[PDB]
Design a protein around this ligand. Structure first.
Ligand SMILES: CC(C)CCC[C@@H](C)[C@H]1CC[C@H]2[C@@H]3CC=C4C[C@@H](O)CC[C@]4(C)[C@H]3CC[C@]12C
Ligand SMILES: CC(C)CCC[C@@H](C)[C@H]1CC[C@H]2[C@@H]3CC=C4C[C@@H](O)CC[C@]4(C)[C@H]3CC[C@]12C
Ligand SMILES: CC(C)CCC[C@@H](C)[C@H]1CC[C@H]2[C@@H]3CC=C4C[C@@H](O)CC[C@]4(C)[C@H]3CC[C@]12C
Ligand SMILES: CCCCCCCC/C=C\CCCCCCCC(=O)OC[C@@H](O)CO
Ligand SMILES: CCCCCCCC/C=C\CCCCCCCC(=O)OC[C@H](O)CO
Ligand SMILES: CCCCCCCC/C=C\CCCCCCCC(=O)OC[C@H](O)CO
Ligand SMILES: CCCCCCCC/C=C\CCCCCCCC(=O)OC[C@H](O)CO
Ligand SMILES: CCCCCCCC/C=C\CCCCCCCC(=O)OC[C@H](O)CO
Ligand SMILES: CCCCCCCC/C=C\CCCCCCCC(=O)OC[C@H](O)CO
Ligand SMILES: Nc1nc(NCCc2ccc(O)cc2)nc2nc(-c3ccco3)nn12
Ligand SMILES: CCCCCCCC/C=C/CCCCCCCC(=O)O
Ligand SMILES: CCCCCCCC/C=C\CCCCCCCC(=O)O
Ligand SMILES: CCCCCCCC/C=C\CCCCCCCC(=O)O
Ligand SMILES: CCCCCCCC/C=C\CCCCCCCC(=O)O
Ligand SMILES: CCCCCCCC/C=C\CCCCCCCC(=O)O
Ligand SMILES: CCCCCCCC/C=C\CCCCCCCC(=O)O
Ligand SMILES: CCCCCCCC/C=C\CCCCCCCC(=O)O
Ligand SMILES: CCCCCCCC/C=C\CCCCCCCC(=O)O
Ligand SMILES: CCCCCCCC/C=C\CCCCCCCC(=O)O
Ligand SMILES: CCCCCCCC/C=C\CCCCCCCC(=O)O
Ligand SMILES: CCCCCCCC/C=C\CCCCCCCC(=O)O
Ligand SMILES: CCCCCCCC/C=C\CCCCCCCC(=O)O
Ligand code: NA
Length: 390
């Protein structure tokens, strides 16, 4: 058996490296939001809370991980805090991710009522609540759901731990049934699936709105040909009554509102001509709607389409964050399920256990990178902060 300090020297070195990268990267995220007003929106206040949890992973959780890797003697309940504090940070990260998902879904469904519903004051209140709930969920083993009353006295006596002390090891003090059912299934897996559902609703909402935009645009043009090729004024009337319905519904910034008053107004003039039996007068009047189309409606069509495909891109990037979170944390969870559900399976090897632990901590390094590559606003603010200062 190779000396244990050798493998542990690699682990601790890798742990410290990740801590540096998690602190630096997420400190850069928080500094960009504080600095750039374009990044000071409600969505980014959850990014800041998620950035705060990653900073704390390198400042506290990783130093705690290195500690518990040594099995040092400790009062079991103090050992519990060392083991479970990271479960607080990951639980807050999940609430922050979930909050972001719901934030964008409210933005895509009811943009007109978003600014009045999702305010900064309310986001701060939600963040404060989610952290309290994160501390309660993460520190639930401290409330009694622990194996401190069932100490491994064979291991405790080995390393000469005093009265009420235990060789501080994660699996000796934290009960696996909490890790699998409560922390993974209930508190991580369920919210993650909910996030999946929310983002699938964001992409569905956007796809349906881009179909609506193109459906109303094809209606304006398809049906304009119906008037050009009309034979009687009632056919020009049956066509004009559809665009006025499609125009009033599409009306739901100063000159987009202006062009829609011209369009509905022009439809009302050609519709009146059609009611008076003026088929050709209504046709010429309807040809004036093509002036309003190009000068106004064509511009609102590329503005609403651009805003929606901006929301799809932003939603994709933010979904990549949730996927990478799952990617980095699932291995640790999945191994726990094997230790728990398969007592006949040989425990995962120590090198894989700490590879999974390291992988889970690497998630605290990746988020600043996704922002620097996907969100132009964050990227430009990073190049500005770094060119100016560091
Ligand atoms: C405000 C923050 C940043 C300060 C850091 C405080 C941390 C490091 C403190 C708070 C509670 C502390 C623990 C409380 C109890 C015990 C049991 C003892 O037998 C070994 C030390 C141990 C496990 C302590 C380790 C250090 C600890 C985790
Ligand atoms: C989330 C994505 C990346 C998938 C991750 C799946 C990983 C964690 C899976 C794939 C194969 C799995 C291993 C398959 C078989 C064994 C042998 C058993 O005696 C202990 C568990 C152990 C060692 C498993 C641990 C978890 C494992 C490594
Ligand atoms: C996020 C998505 C992937 C859902 C997560 C599915 C998880 C919970 C699944 C994927 C693989 C599964 C494991 C596959 C094999 C075994 C060995 C068996 O003797 C006990 C159950 C156990 C240990 C399963 C537990 C549940 C498990 C870990
Ligand atoms: C444990 C170690 C550190 C705790 C986490 C650090 C958290 C740092 C907080 C950053 C912050 O709120 O500033 C940006 C915003 O104010 C801009 O809107
Ligand atoms: C972490 C606790 C110390 C325990 C010591 C043992 C963890 C970090 C908690 C960070 C809480 C603030 C979250 C945040 O910064 O978000 C602000 C929000 O964005 C407003 O705009
Ligand atoms: C800001 C703050 C950043 C966090 C600083 C790192 C902290 C504590 C974790 C290390 C806990 C040390 C335990 C050592 C111990 O008490 O064990 C003695 C030995 O086992 C008896 O022989
Ligand atoms: C909340 C929801 C919040 C939960 C607040 C925590 C409620 C107090 C729990 C407590 O006091 O438990 C101490 C511990 O059990 C001593 O061993
Ligand atoms: C999740 C989404 C969570 C779904 C988890 C549902 C798993 C419940 C089945 C179970 O707990 O298995 C009991 C068995 O006795 C073990 O020893
Ligand atoms: C998420 C769903 C995951 C549910 C996985 C349950 C696995 C299970 O039931 O474990 C078998 C048990 O050990 C029988 O001996
Ligand atoms: N099972 C587990 N173990 C550890 N550390 C102990 C590694 C170990 C496991 C077995 C052994 O004989 C010696 C050492 N940290 C752990 N963290 C988690 C975890 C955190 C979040 C979700 O799962 N699970 N987990
Ligand atoms: C609001 C921060 C205070 C601590 C929150 C405790 C979290 C546990 C309770 C969860 C239910 C939601 C809490 C809402 C309390 C404030 C309600 C309000 O004043 O509008
Ligand atoms: C990021 C890159 C991860 C791969 C680099 C190596 C990381 C650690 C793997 C685990 C090393 C063996 C664990 C031994 C720890 C111990 O002795 O307690
Ligand atoms: C990065 C710096 C790594 C410093 C070495 C940490 C491991 C030392 C040790 O095993 O005690
Ligand atoms: C991963 C880490 C990214 C490194 C970021 C470099 C900028 C350092 C200055 C800062 O942390 O604010
Ligand atoms: C340890 C972790 C430190 C996180 C630092 C993140 C930087 C984000 C801004 C913190 C808020 C206070 C900023 C005021 C600094 C002075 C100034 O106004 O320029
Ligand atoms: C700002 C403060 C930053 C935190 C710095 C505090 C020191 C950090 C951890 C020191 C580790 C203590 C381990 C003691 C060794 C146990 C022993 O002597 O046997
Ligand atoms: C940060 C300072 C670098 C040294 C920290 C690792 C200490 C080794 C150990 O935990 O035993
Ligand atoms: C901003 C400060 C960040 C943290 C600074 C301290 C980092 C030191 C690294 C890990 C702490 C490990 C302490 C030693 C473990 C206990 C030793 C033992 O009991 O055997
Ligand atoms: C902040 C600066 C932190 C300074 C260095 C912390 C070094 C921790 C050393 C722990 C050694 C554990 C041991 O004695 O075995
Ligand atoms: C960001 C800060 C959020 C507010 C933090 C305070 C909320 C605390 C919530 C519940 C704590 C439950 C754990 C109590 C364990 C006590 C330790 C022990 O058992 O000895
Ligand atoms: C559990 C995951 C269910 C996925 C929900 C997708 C959203 C929808 O209903 O269309
Ligand atoms: C990327 C590399 C992933 C590393 C491990 C994948 C799983 C391989 C099986 C682990 C050893 C099985 C065992 O002996 O328990
Ligand atoms: Na911890």
């Amino acid at each position: 058996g190779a000396p244990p300090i050798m493998g542990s020297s690699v682990y601790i070195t890798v742990e410290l490296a990740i801590a540096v990268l998690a602190i630096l990267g997420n400190v850069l995220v928080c500094w960009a939001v504080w600095l750039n007003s374009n990044l000071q929106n409600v969505t980014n206040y959850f990014v800041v809370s998620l950035a705060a949890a990653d900073i704390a992973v390198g400042v506290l959780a990783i130093p705690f991980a290195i500690t518990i890797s040594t099995g040092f003697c400790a009062a079991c309940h103090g050992c519990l805090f060392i083991a479970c504090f990271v479960l607080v940070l990951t639980q807050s990260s999940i609430f922050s991710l979930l909050a972001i998902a719901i934030d964008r879904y409210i933005a895509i469904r009811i943009p007109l009522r978003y600014n009045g519903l999702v305010t900064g004051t309310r986001a701060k209140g939600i963040i404060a609540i989610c952290w309290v709930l994160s501390f309660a969920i993460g520190l639930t083993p401290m409330l009694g759901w622990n194996n401190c009353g069932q100490p491994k006295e064979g291991k405790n006596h080995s390393q000469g731990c005093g009265e009420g002390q235990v060789a501080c090891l994660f699996e000796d003090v934290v009960p696996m049934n909490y890790m699998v059912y409560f922390n993974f299934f209930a508190c991580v897996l369920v919210p993650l699936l909910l996030m999946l559902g929310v983002y699938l609703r964001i992409f569905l909402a956007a796809r349906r709105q881009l179909a609506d935009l193109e459906d109303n645009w094809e209606t304006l043009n398809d049906n304009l040909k119906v008037i050009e090729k009309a034979d009687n004024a009632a056919q020009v009337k049956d066509a004009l009554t559809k665009m006025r319905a499609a125009a009033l519904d599409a009306q739901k910034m100063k000159d987009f509102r202006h062009g829609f008053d011209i369009l509905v107004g022009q439809i009302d003039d050609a519709l009146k001509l059609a009611n008076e039996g003026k088929v050709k007068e209504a046709q010429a009047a309807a040809e004036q709607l093509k002036t309003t189309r190009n000068a106004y409606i064509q511009k609102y069509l590329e503005r609403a389409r651009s805003t929606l495909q901006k929301e799809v891109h932003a939603a994709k990037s933010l979904a990549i964050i949730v996927g990478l979170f799952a990617l980095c944390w699932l291995p640790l969870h999945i191994i726990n399920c094997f230790t728990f559900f398969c007592p006949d399976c040989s425990h995962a090897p120590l090198w894989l256990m700490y590879l999974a632990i390291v992988l889970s901590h690497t998630n605290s390094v990746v988020n600043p990178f996704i922002y620097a590559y996907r969100i132009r606003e964050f990227r430009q603010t990073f190049r500005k902060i770094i060119r100016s200062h560091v």
